[PDB]
Amino acid sequence: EPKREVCELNPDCDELADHIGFQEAYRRFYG
């Protein structure tokens, strides 16, 4: 899961993923 890999290594992305999941967080951060 490269999206999770990238997003987990950004505290803001990971925090967003805590709320909306990694795919949505990644899209909002790295879309």
Swiss-Prot record:
Disulfide bond residue pairs: 7-13
Binding site for Ca(2+) 3: 8, 14
Post-translational modification: Gamma-carboxyglutamate residues are formed by vitamin K dependent carboxylation by GGCX. These residues are essential for the binding of calcium. Decarboxylation promotes the hormone activity.
Domain Gla: 1-31
Record-listed 4-carboxyglutamate modification sites: 1, 5, 8
Cellular localisation: Secreted
Binding site for Ca(2+) 2: 5, 8
Sequence positions that bind Ca(2+) 1: 1
Described function: The carboxylated form is one of the main organic components of the bone matrix, which constitutes 1-2% of the total bone protein. It acts as a negative regulator of bone formation and is required to limit bone formation without impairing bone resorption or mineralization. The carboxylated form binds strongly to apatite and calcium.
Family in the record: Belongs to the osteocalcin/matrix Gla protein family.
Protein name: Osteocalcin
UniProt organism field: Bos taurus
Taxonomic lineage from the root: Eukaryota, Metazoa, Chordata, Craniata, Vertebrata
Gene this chain is encoded by: BGLAP
Part of the full-length chain shown: 68 to 98 of 100
